[model samples]
Every structure is written in structure tokens, then in C-alpha cells.
Target: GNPFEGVQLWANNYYRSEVHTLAIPQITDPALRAAASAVAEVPSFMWLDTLDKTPLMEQTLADIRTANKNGGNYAGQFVVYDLPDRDCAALASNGEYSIADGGVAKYKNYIDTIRQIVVEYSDIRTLLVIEPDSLANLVTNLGTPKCANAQSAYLECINYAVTQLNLPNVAMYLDAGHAGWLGWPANQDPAAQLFANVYKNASSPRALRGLATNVANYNAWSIASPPSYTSPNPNYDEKHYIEAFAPLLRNQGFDAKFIVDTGRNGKQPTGQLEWGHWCNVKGTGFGVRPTANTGHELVDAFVWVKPGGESDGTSDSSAPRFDSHCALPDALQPAPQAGAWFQAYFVQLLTNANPSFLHHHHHH
Candidate 1:
């Protein structure tokens, strides 16, 4: 019997936008809408950005409710990414960390508010992507003295939100960067070590079940090449990324599944390019064709946390908007290139269904 055969699944798109307009139809075109529906009915997951100094928290709650009712896919499910100030790792270094000063309180308010919304819409299921680039970027790059403590605080906030927003239909995936990003040894094991400590305790029961990889970026497979830097041991490849974490996962007794962001990485990039950037590197291989297998076994379910075609931010090289960037070659080039990430997404869905790729093998 075919495992994924005949399963009609839809990959949900999560993003943040200014709530003033609050018009989904106005922002998106017909073709994108049709393409989204083709994969599965689409839904909008909105969040309250930190820029809202006044903290129009109540308005955000209202907007999500309205979007759900007006939008087609809300009934199926809705997602909430980055629960307010979720990216405050920089502040953690200054000892002015929001998590330290009522961060949980703020997140609690949001969770409680969202829970009320979910209850009102009994038919709706919700997924919380929780803090993109918060964990992965912070744990590795953020060298704050309390970096470890800051991560702990972050986990605490996530756990608090999950517990407070406890709903049967809700599922939460903590962002774990991507396969290529974490595939390096220096980065991978240390990140896993932090998780091992955070999730082990029994008190924080709602701690993340597993880590999520490749959120809001292309869904590419890990590159075969190793990082140029020297390390404790020389030979490192993508597989080391997963293997290093095995002990941590096992040590913490975490059954947390690894979810890959299959949204953009249709093809696996190669050479000396950074995994997250749109390097415009040619012949790197088409995006992973969007399915689960890219000739690697470390990956679990591949989901599109980020919808194709949406801007991560502007393509201005000076500002460096991590969220939105143009595809390789030209960052500002138009639509189809912007949507190429999704094309690979659709193709992968098709490939996973093929009979030839569905067979299981027991190799010794």
C-alpha cells in the first residue's frame, strides 16, 4: 500500500503584513490564489508586529477573526508566527530582554486572546510556527553573555503560549533553521545541546516536541560540500548536521519530529553559497522538486511554512531585509521568479505521489 498515495494535502502559507488594509483579496492576484488552492485551500496567518508601538493587540485579534471569516481557508486552519517581540535576542544582551521583563506576560495575553478566537470558530484548526530565525539565529550567532539563558527564556515563552493557548486542534513547531543552515558541525551540535537542556525538564511540559527547519525560505536540501572553516574534526557534510543532533534528541528523550520548510527549496543549492541567501548561483540544481526526499534520510515531513512570491523584504543590498529578497540573479525581478519557489513546491507534491518513489527498501 502507498503511504502518501491519494492523500489530498494542502501546504499552509504564513506571513505578516500591515493590518490597516486587512484586505487579502487586494494584496494577492488571481493566479497566485488559484495556485495556492491547487495545493490545498489557502489560509492567512497574521501577527501583531513589534512596530505597533501602541500594541493594537485587540485589533490584531479582531483582524484574524475577520480574515478567517472572509478568507476561504480559515475554516480548515490558521497559523500564527512569531508571537510579538519574538525576535528580541539583541535586547537580551543588553539585560533589557522583554522575556526577562514580562515577556511571558505579553505572550500570555496574545495566546489567551487567540485561544478565545479559536474557540469561537470550532471548525478552525490552528498552527503556530512560533518565532522564525529566533532560535536558530540567536543560539548560533547571538554571542550575548546570557545567550544560553536567553534561549531558555525564549523556550519558556513558547511553552507558556502553548499551555495557555492549549487547544486540541492546535499544533506548534519551533523553528530550527534549515538543513543547510544547521548542516554544519560547528553550528549544529551546539544548537542541539541547548535544546537538550531546555526540553529535558518535566516542569515545562509544553516545551517544543521537535524542531522545525527552513521556515519562510526556499526548501532546499543540504549541500554536499563542507564549511571552509576548520573545526574539532575536519570531515563534515550535511549528514553531520542531523547525526550530531541524534545524541541530543536521544538524550532529552525528545520524539520531536523535524519539519522541513518545503516552500522554497525545490532544488538543493551548491558551491560556496550561504544556504539562506538568494545568491543567483546557476546550475546549483533546481530547488529540491518540493517533495520529502532529496536523496537524504534526515528530513521528516516537508511543509511550506512560507508561501512563494511574497517578498521577504526589499532587495536593497544596503538594508538587508532577511524576510524578503529576490531570487538569484536579480533580487527585484518580477512575479514568476518570485513564485518559482512555489512552482518547485507544487512539483514536489506531485513527485512524492509517484509510485516509483514510494517503495520502501531495507538495506544492510
Candidate 2:
């Protein structure tokens, strides 16, 4: 039942990097240009973060279909974001909907539209990460009024998505915020319990396969030794997170699979002012490319959930949604806005890329 069994994500000569074609030509440094070219060809998830973005999603899938004409095996990966009161804990990526003002309705409409497009491509395999940071907030940030008030809507909307989008060709993984957020000893049990409840509440749809972690954060997929700052938090990395968290989920009644985002955790960000400084941590680079050959049984894949070069948040403090984390000394400076292309940041990612894009290239 593994949707990824023997299939490379977004394969068949279809690369989503085409959207960045304009940005690629602007990179003047020859070495960086080569790295950028390589990075662009790397397959990552498409963020259908808003309703307006659905048309683009359809077009991309259509392009994928064209590329698959020769019948090469490939799968499309997507991040189904935009929950009501999205990212209640942060303002930078806050969505257009809110529970108070018909956000749930709009989100369902978004889901419906997406389903229509994806279902049309029955021949294509699809993997979806459902609502990043949505349920994770319910675990840790419920103390905040914004999170607390939006709790029901989060559960409701997520259930609605699981029910509505559980298509034959689709595989879904609910977002489990990375180890830094939910892997603490105190959070493991509650996190498992919450996910169990959501799965059961949503009828345990077969397509709802597992959890997605480290969606857009800098967290090593695994490390031999825990970082000094990660003291007492045994789930020090995403691999350890799966080792610790997956069993708990199975015990709670679902045999959960996992996907870790290696988008920017290529190298651990040094001199982090805080472990939780997620907005554009400087000096990080691209990590493992998307692949389903993860050695761990529970881990389905290591994916690029957050696209490289996109600003995590704007560094401009004057911006309405500007988050303080983006302004921290460790964050990349002069960031434009969340989801905006960041040329300088992209260059840094390529330069520091763990595999060193210049030396390491994908084959087959």
C-alpha cells in the first residue's frame, strides 16, 4: 500500500523547478548557477496554500501528465495547507481564513477545488501533507488564546479534508510539527493521543497514511549525537522523532508512517539564538533530495516540503505579518516575505548544501 513503493517523486522528466526559471537566469555566479540548476531540478512539494493557487496546481499536474507520455513512473507530492486560522501560532504564514468569519467554509471549498483537479489526473500518484502547523499547534500552543479558540476549527477542518480528499490515487499525511516542537518528553503522549483522535474522528481513512514532520524547519533527519541545546529532549532529530513517536502512534491505534522535510536542514544552523528560531535561519542549505528509500521502516520518505529560496518571513519589521523570529540576529537579513523568492538565501543554500550540489548530483 505504499504509494511510493519503487516510485521516485515527480519523476519522468517533470520538475517543478520550472516556476523558478526566471529566478535561475538571474544567478550570475557560475558555481552558484550550476548549483541552482541542480537544485531547481530537485523535486519538491507544491504548496496549494491558497485558493488562488489552485489553477497553477492544475497546470503543473497537466505538465506532469505531458512529461509522463512515455510512461515513466513518478508521483506528485503536494502540501495541502490553508487550514482555518492557519498557523495560529505565527503571523507570517497566516492564511486567508479564520473560524470566526467563515474560514472553514472557504477552506472546504479550497479542498473541493483541489480534489477536482487532482482527481482528474487519475493516472498520477499523489501524496499530500495536510495542513502544516495546524494540528501541531493544538499540541503545544493551545495555551494561546488564538490557538485555544481555533482548536475545534482545526480538528473539524482537518477531518473535513481527510474525508473529502481521501481519493484512490491519493496518500495523505497530517502534519506533525518537528521534534523541536512536539518531540519533548512531555509532548509525545499528548501528541500521539491528539493524532489518534483525529484519525479516528476522520474515520481512519485509508489514504490518511501517516504524519509529516519538519515541514519547513531546520532539523537534522538524524544525527549520531544530540546537539548540546537539545538536552533532555531525546527526540533530537527527525529520525529519532520517528523512532520515538511512531511506536506511540501505533500503540494509540494507528500504524503511522512518516515523512521528514530535509528542505533546509542540510547543515545545522550554528549560533542559533534559540532552538525554535524557524524563520530563515542563516547558513543552512538543502538536505537530502526527495526519496522513498529511507532506511527506517516507518519513514516513507525524506522530502522537500518547503521550497528553498522562499523567504520564511520578511525581515522588514514594519510589515504587518513580520514575525520577530525573522528579525532575530541568526535569521537571514533583508528577507522579502514568506513564500517570496530569496536570491541571496538560495545562493547560500546551494553554497552550504550538505551534499554540495556542485559535487553531488542526482543520477537516475
Candidate 3:
């Protein structure tokens, strides 16, 4: 208990993402309303993807600093995704920064600023999920030219982050990707091995807490083939996903404790392969509230990473860009840009919630 002291789930930080935007003007269903009645401050990441977003990050830390001081029971979390060539193969999140440019050095400067801010908040408990989709994507796409240099810089920056942000108040977890993709027979073993190399590359394992799962996708806590049984089917549940990677993470990173994003996993997934089934899918809703006790020896807590109601990326090029995944037949109709809210989608999520929850309802 002592080791976990000061560790608490973060209240949702309001931002410009899909869900946050819609919970206001877009949603009209009295059942769904916003600055939502049930909505709480979440520990979602600061997400410093673009260069000009630093002030946003700084301001977030400022609010968190005050909140950590004031909020008695609820502590906050922050995720960092400053990777050079983010989502290596995917066009949706790829940005100006890349190993091809001055990304490695750029990331150093970015973290240096963030490090000072983090230092000031040392008294507060902050969780940092470093570089989402960086390593695992590297493993999946290393054969292509996209990741060749990006992978090197990606690992370098994350390792740099590990060294600089190794604070007692900060729990850092590297991305273990998600169950559906990394759990595949061919990708599992290598992904585990990749984690081993990345963890070892860091100066020490002391900087790590564990790895994060199902960041922005819908994978349940536990589900089975018949959907009647709840068991460790690595393909479906984040819990079992952790179990699948247990040996690898343990062998490499000493079985670090992890946080799952139940932010949008409440409903069941549709397609057979959820590998890249991200973006706003139909029938998804909020899952378990964030907590430390997941009832599993290794599981840390369920978190809301993707932030329900946010569009992953519109299902069509009608979005800012055309992502191959969103084009699939199973995907919902084209909505808005990634991080932009789609009201109907929110309605679907509220309607399909597993142990259903209405955003406003009584509170609305």
C-alpha cells in the first residue's frame, strides 16, 4: 500500500479532442449532454504531438499541479506522445517531426521543458505513458523505409524520457501496443523481444512501472469466443492481453504494473481483427472507471486513454486524411476529423454501454 500511496486515477482534462468538442454543441439528446453531468476529469495524456502545443502542455501541468494540491482523493495522470514519426505507417498521426528532420534533438528540447514542469509537480502523483504506438509500430513496420530512421529516434527519445522523468511521483509505462495486434501469433514473440531491448536500452528499469494496453481502441476487460464466457482470450480482453505478454514483460521489464484504458471498451468489438480498428467505431461506450485495484496480480487499473466520443479519424478521406483502417466496411460512416466530436457516435456509445451509463440522464 505504501508503494502505491499518492497514486490515484486522474480526472479527465478537458481538451479539443473529438469527445470534448461534441459533449457541448453537437450532442442534443437530453440523455447525452455536456460538460457532462457524469463526466469527470480524466487522466488522458497531454499529447504533445505538434511543436506549437507546448503551451497547452504547460497549462495542463499547471492545472494538474493545483488539482493535485487541492483534490484530496483524486490524483491525475498525463500521457506523452512526442514520437518523431508517430504511428510510423499511418498517415493520420504522422507529423512534421521525424528522424529525417531534427526530431531526436527536437524531442530532447521538448522533454527538457516538460521535465522542469514535472519537477515542480513532484509532490503530485502523475502517470506518463511514453510514446504511444512508437515501439510496437516499429516492430510491426521495421521492414519498411518509414520506420528505419524513425525507429532509432523513437527509441532514443523514449529512453531519454525514461532517464529524465524517473520520479517517484511519476509512473511511466511504455506502450505495449494492444492485444489484438501484438497478441497475434506472429507478432507476439517479437513484440515482447522488442520491449526487452527497449527496456534494457534505458539506463534502468526503475524508471518504468509497466506497459499500457488498448490505448484508443475497444477491447474488453475479459471476453470469450461464445461471448457468454469471460476468460483470458488474449485476442479479446486487456487482462488476458497482459497475461499473454506477461512472460516477455517480466523477462525484460520485471513485470511492471499497467493501466488499461477502459475509457471506451464498455461495449463489445465488432470485427474479427481489431488490430487497427481504432477511430470512432459504432456501438462503443465508456468502460470501468479508473482504479488501482483490477483484481489481477499484475494489472494496475483501467484508464480511459482514447477518450470516448472522439473520432479516431473519420472513416473516409472526407476526414483530414484517409486512413486505410477507417475505410473498412464495418466502420461507421465518415464523421469529423480525428479528435473532433461526432454526436450520433456518442449516442451509439451511450446506447450500447455494457453495464450501460448515460452521460447526463439523471444529472442531465
Candidate 4:
């Protein structure tokens, strides 16, 4: 019965850099004050994809200390995303690691770096959101020839990560791709089954607390997808998605508690194009600040797992089809890497904030 204790999560220099440079000035300005708060409660999402140990060690210790300093509790969200063929659907976050070239062998070393932090900071609470799109992508592409080898490696490595990083203080939540990824029409049950299979096979005792949903997605928590997702099946919104999927997890002998990402659900997705329009699509706003008390028995927290202002991908860049969704018209202009700042989008987010945000601070 270890309900995740709530506390102030840490914001890193990366996000603070965005706030200092763009979010603070624009949001605090009198012109946009009616739109966003002077102190926008943003949270940092750590991308632990490299073999290097510096980032893992430094941030884990720093975030824990900062949390304890600020609110007497230490917690952080670490995204473990360096699979052998990471980001199989999109070329965007694909890493140097590969399965054909000894993927597990490489990840063994990489998770060693991660394990040091989890084990070292054994007292500090950390939410290791294991591999965002990894399991869902495998289930979706099970029949594809390209995914043949990547599939096995993907399954094997995540289980390995769970086993290695299982510490009492660390909570592992495998990222079940958002409402769009799994909840699209008839894909729900199978996706839930796949996630359960991964959870059952890849984890040891207490390695998994639950599944994380809507990570880096823009699904509105309150809105239902349509009539089908309303009444009998509420598998449309983040809340309902968890409700529908939890029983499947229970059947597999796991009492899962989820962390829902409310980072970008300022408004409902228009679906002008396809439903899966994720890459920096226009019209998104920040969600509830990170918290453990979600009022739902299965949901541990509603978190901002994807820091706002970070470009999902370059919409109009010279880069090849990293993801054709980036080519959608609603997608924003060119930006840097996956987590880099997209200032224009940031301003728009503040303007589009739900429940309306405001700032008292004066600025030009």
C-alpha cells in the first residue's frame, strides 16, 4: 500500500533556461498576463538515453536534493528511452544503439549507469517511466519484417531495465502510448494485453507500479473522444483510458497505478488530419501540475511528463521523414532536437492555457 507521496518535483536548468529566456518574459508581459501566470508551474522530463553516467548521477542527486529542500520530499521523472532502435516509428529520437550491433550488450552498460543512480539515491523517490513508445510500437508493428529483430531486443531489454533498476525508492511505470496510440477504435484490448504481457514478462517483484499514459501527448483529461468513448466505454480520455486498461493489468496479476501526462491538453485535438497528429501540432495548453493525489484509486499522479515549449519534431525542417506527422500543416516551424525550445509554440501555449492563467508581474 505504498501510495506515491506527493511533493514538489524538480525543474532542471533546461526548463529554467526556457522560462528565463522565453516563457517568463512573454507570459509575464501585460499583453499575455491574462493568458498565463508569472510563475508557470512547469516540470522537467529527463531523457536518460545515453551510456554516459554524468547526467544520470548529477540530476538524480540534484532533483532529490532540490525537492527535499523545497518541500521536504524528493521526486523526479526519468524517461528511459535509449532502446536498441529507439523511436522505431519516428526517426526523431532514434539513438546510436542498435540490436543487430549488440543492443542488449550496449543497454546493459547503459542501465548500469541508470542503476547506479537508482541504487545510490535509494532513499529518494524517482519515477522511472520506462521507454515511452517502446512496447506500443512493438505491438503495432508485430507483423512488419523490419521490426522482427528489433521486437525481440525491445522486449528483452525493457525487462532487463526493470530487473536492474528495481530499488525500493524507485517506481517504474512503463509508458503505455496515449489515447491515440492504443485507444484508437479497436486497438484498445490488444494494446492492453500487450502492455500486460510486457509488464508480466519484463518485471520482477515491485519493479512496476503501473503504466504511464499520455506521455508527450495532448489528450484532454475531461473531454470524451466521442459517443463510443462515452456511456459504456470511457476509453477516450486519460482517466477513462486508465479505467479501461487497469482491469486488463489486474488480470495479469498487477495492481497498476498510473501517471497521466496533462502537459499539453489545453484544448481537444481538432483531428483535422489523422487522429495521431502528435508532432508539435497546433493548439495545446499546459495541464495540471505534477501531483500524487489524482482522486482515482489507480492513478498515482497527473504529471507534466513532456515539458512544454520543447518541439516534438521539426515540422518544416530539411530533415527527411523522421515522422511525416511533422509535415502536417498544424505542426509548427523548424526547431532543434526533440527536447529543444520552440518559442512560438510556448507563447501560443500560454495564450491557450485552460482555466485561463495570469501574471501580475510587469514586463515590456
Candidate 5:
């Protein structure tokens, strides 16, 4: 019956960004050019993080349609990211909709619109990562007033998404902030409880596939030489987090398959003073490529949820939306605002890619 296998997520080539593809030719340096070109060829997700990007979504789906028609059976991956009081705990990713401004209704409209577009492209298999940082904020970040205020809307909106967007051709994953955040001993149980509450509220969404971890964050999939902060929190990496937390969520009542973002996580945190620092982290690299062949059973796939070339946030303190985390010693400086193209950061990721993209070759 083809029960939505992980191979299907990328079995057909995943959508590659036109933006990144267009910029590939601009890399004049022969070696860098090859690296960028190679990265572009790898299956990566397109972020439908803002409403403005909806047109891009239509265009991308069309592009995938053409690609599949021409030769390969290309699937597409997307992040359904905009939410009321978005990025509630972080200033850098604060989205356009606010709960006070009828955000819940706007969010419902947004999900409906996305659902329609996805249904239109039913011929192409699609993966949707639902609302990164939305529910996760409710778990550990309720202390922030905005987070506390956005709680109900976040719950309602995510429920609306799970119910409306559960299309036959589409599979969805709810965002679970990386191991570093929810993996803490005090946080896991509450996090599972919160997620189960949302799942039940959605009437047990049919399209809900699992949880996604480390989206736009730097946490290794697994590391042998653990960081100094590993004690008391056994989940030092994304793998350990899935291993520990999946059982909790399953027991709480739901399948707990996981997808982890290996984008910008090739190297371990070096200059970070604490595990919480998550700006455009310095010394990071591209980690594993998208694949369903994860050694762990619960981990369905390893994906590039955050496009490597995009900036996390601006370093300018004067910027209204700027977060102090972006200016921290470990964060990359002089970066553009979040979601803007960051060439310097891209180069760093290429240069430090864990599997070494420099020497890598693609037969296809």
C-alpha cells in the first residue's frame, strides 16, 4: 500500500531552490563553484515561511512537475513556518502576524491557502514541516510574555494546519526544537505532554507523520566527543534526543517517527558559551545529505530544513527585530536579516562540510 516510506521523501529528487541554483554560476572560484553547484544538486526544502513566498511555492511546484516529467521522480519538501506570534521566544524570527491582530484567523487562511496549492500538485509527493518554533516555544519559552500570549493561537493554528493540510500526497512533521532545548531533563516530559495535547486536539491528524528536530539550529546528529554540558542532559545530539524522547511521545499516544535537520550542523559548537546560542552560528558546516536510510528506526530521515545559504538574523544591534543572540561572540557577525541570502555563511558551510563536499562526486 506504500505507507509513506522515508525513501519517498527524497526517493524522487527533492526540490532544489531556483534562488540557490541561479546563484551557482556566480561563484567564480572553480572550487567554490563546484561546491555550490554540488550543494544545489542535493535535495533541500523550500521554506514557505512567509505569505509572500506562496507565489514561489506555486512556481516551485511547477518546476518540480517539469523535472519529474522530464526524467526523475522529484518530490518536494517545504516548511509551513508562519504562525501567530511566530518565533515567540526569539526576536529575529518574529513573523508578521501577532495574536492581538486577529492572528488566529489569518493563520487559518494561510493554512487553507497552502493546502489548496499542495492539493493542486497531488501528482508530486510533498513533505511539509509544520510551524517550526511554534509549539516548541509553548514548552520551554512560556516565561516570555509574547510566548505566553501566543499560546492559545499557536495551539489553535497548529491544530488547524494538521486537520486541513492532511492531503493524500503530503506528509507532515511538527517541529520539535533541537535536543539542546527540549532534551533537557526537565523539559522532555512536558514537551511530550504538550505535543500529545495538540495531536489529540487535532483529532489525531491523518497527515501528521512525526516530529522534526534541529530545524535552523546546529546540533550534530550524533557526536562521539560530547560537549561539556552533556551531563544531566543525556541527549547531547539529535540522535540521542530522538532515542530518548520518541519513547515518551509514543507512550503519551502517537507514532514518534523523527526527521532531523543536518543543515549547518556538520561541526560541533566551538565558540558557543552555552548550548542555547542559535544565531548564524560560526564554524558550522553542512552535515548529512537528505536520506531515509537512517540507522535508527524511529528517525525516518535526515533533512536540510534550513537552507544553508540563508542568514539566521542580522547582527546589527540597531535593527528593530535584531536579537542579542545574533550578536553573541559565537554568532556570525555582519549577517543579513533572517531568511536573507548569506554568501559568506554559505562559503563557511561549504568549506567545513563534514563529509567534505570538495572531494565528493555525484554520478547522477
Candidate 6:
């Protein structure tokens, strides 16, 4: 049995752009070392999300190669969840110069380039959580020609990536919002319907395996409506949320296993309005503590797909607000203070003591 078989080092390039500002010597320097040390120790895998000023691909590939050559434990133990956009909104809201247009092409190029690196260098295992909200929110909210075309284009590009990369260890998970975002009975039908639509349109190449649900959201639990805690389950509970769609997935023959965003559910609140915006949800804590209690057949495993503390696009931006989207005060408020919010969150996830988990399920 392989030592890396069951364990997965879930990684994200958290603030790679900012961190690179310090010279490599400074990165390893004792005076400026606390942050670097914190970053290195975090259980999550790190990669370059943006390459604005720094040639991130070259830099990251170099770092990865060095880690591999130095007998570093991170060699084949990391999963690179790449974000192709400079910002989430670029993909989520912007149309004129969206990733969907040349963005998909850029991602395809990135994947192709990375695949070549993997072939030439270390055999690092990676799971690409490609294009987060591009599928979940765009197809439904954006409406009509552009939305449908974008979704189709994305599916095609992802298929191309999967094929070009051609790595057995690299799996792709399509974002399905969260248990709450799509769990409402009314929303469940539409959600499933929308997923089917996307699936129908998605390019099914041999490299593309299956889809995943609920990335970087809370663990599944019962939602209780106001005035009732012990009795009738309310729309607010996780039970209602999961129950609504569990059967739907089964009925529709989706066969895709769902993964929960367990990073913040530990302290998930039970009452209404308790759900905070994705940034720093009030009650939520580290990874899902009690995995044994999830109680759903189709659920593969609870995973920390999203590193804790990574911003979900400011409190007010067009970005997808992590797990707590609707709970925000001015739900429709535009982008909040830019880099301030995410940086703090990134730090929190870095110092937190929690194991990042992954799941393996047979897909036919």
C-alpha cells in the first residue's frame, strides 16, 4: 500500500502574490520568518493562484521542484487546486474580458504547461477544483446566451485540461455551492435540474471523471426554524437541506459523490441569520469535528476543499460568498474592502490546527 494512498495534502496558493513581495532571502530570514514558517506548516497544499507581477508558474514550479529534490515530504503529498483568474469576480461577473473567453484558453494553457512539468519533474498528486462559481452561479443567475455559452465553454475547457494532463491522480470537482445554497426544497429541484443541464452540456472525455458537490462550505447538520428546536425541522437546518437533494441525486442517477466543506461547520450556528457571510462566519470553526454523524449515503467524505481564512471575495464583491452568502446584511452589497478581508482569513487558516481530509469513491 502506498503511504500517500489514503492521505491527501489539500493545498491552495494562499496569498502567493503578496508573499512573493518579500525577497526569497527574506522569505527564509529569521526576522521575516514567522509568516513564512506559519505558511509552510499549514496542513494545506500551497500553489500560485495569480501571476500578476511574479512569473508564478515558474516560481511555483521551481519551489515544487526544490521541495521534491530536497527529499521534502511535500513531494507527492500535495493537491494543487488552481484558480485561473486574477480575481474571482473576473470569472464570476465580468463578461467582456472573462476567463470564459480567453480565460478558458489561458487555463488550458496553464494545465498543459503544468502537465508537462509533472512529466519532466516530480510526480505530485493534484486535484484541480477548477473554476469555482463559474458553473454553479453563472448558468442560473447570469441567464441566457452568455451564461449558457460560458458554462458550455468551461465544460469543454475542463475536459480538454483533464485530457491534456492525463494524470490518474488529478481529479476535478465541479463547485455545487453548498448544502444551504441548493438545499431548499424549491431550490433543490432547480439545483438538480441546473446540474443536469450543465452535465448534459459538459464535455465527457475519458480524463474527466465525475462531479463533486458542496466545496468549502459547512458540514451537514439539521437546520431548525425559529420557535422550534426539538420538533419540526426547518428550512434552516442541514437535515432539510441534505434531505431535499439526497433523494434527488439518487433519483436522477447522478452517481457523483458529494464532498462537504467541513472547514467551518464545527461551530455552525443553529438559528436563522446565524449563517454569516463566507469570510468569517461567526459560529463556524475548523474542520467538521464529527464526521461519523453525517448520515448520508451518497456523501463521499467531508473535505476542507477551501482552506480556512481564504477570503470569498470581500464582504461586498461580486465574488461567491463562501458558505454564508444570503446571511450578509446587505446581501446585494458590491465588493467590500479588497485585500484586507481575505488576508486576515488566510492567516487564520494558516495557524489553525486541523487536519485536511479527502475521500475516494468508485465512479462508474
Better of 3 and 5 by lDDT: 5
lDDT of 3 by residue, 290-356 (tens): 7666787777777777666666676666556668777666567767666566666666666666555
Ranking by TM-score: 2, 5, 4, 3, 6, 1
TM-score for each prediction? 0.58, 0.94, 0.86, 0.87, 0.92, 0.60
**What is the C-alpha local distance difference test score of each model?**
0.45, 0.83, 0.67, 0.71, 0.80, 0.45
Better of 1 and 2 by TM-score: 2
Which of the numbered candidates is closest to the native, going by highest TM-score?
2
Q: Candidate 1 residues 1-364, lDDT tens each?
A: 1111222233333322311122234325554343333333322233333323113433443444566667534322223443434544332111112565776566666566666665665444444555666667556666655444566666666666556555664555566765555655566567776555545543433424456665654433354554442133332332354556655667666655555555444443333244445433222221232333434444544555555334444333334333333444433333232212323323333233222122344599
lDDT of 5 by residue, 206-312 (tens): 77888999999888888986787555578898888888888888898877688899988887754466888888888889998888777888887888888887888
> Cα lDDT for residue 134, model 3?
80
* lDDT tens digits, residue span 1-364, model 2: 6778877677312233542565678877676677777677788888887898788778777867776776766788888988877879875555888788998899889988988988898777888999988888898898888999999888888899999888898899999998889989799999999998899988889899999999998888888888766777888888888898999999978889998899898887444667788888887888988888888888888898888888888899898688888999989899987888777888778888888788854689
- Model 2 gets an lDDT of 0.83
**Candidate 5 whole-model C-alpha lDDT, 0 to 1:** 0.80
Highest-scoring model, lDDT: 2
Report the Cα lDDT for candidate 6. 0.45
TM-score of 5: 0.92
Question: 228-305, model 4: which lDDT tens digit per residue?
Answer: 323343466777777777887788777788888887776666332555667886767766666677788888878777
**Candidate 1 Cα lDDT to native:** 0.45
Off-target runs (Cα >4 Å) in candidate 2 are: 11-22, 91-93, 269-271, 360-364
| Superposed Cα deviation of residue 91, candidate 3 (Å) | 4.1
Q: Tell me which residue pairs clash in candidate 5.
A: none
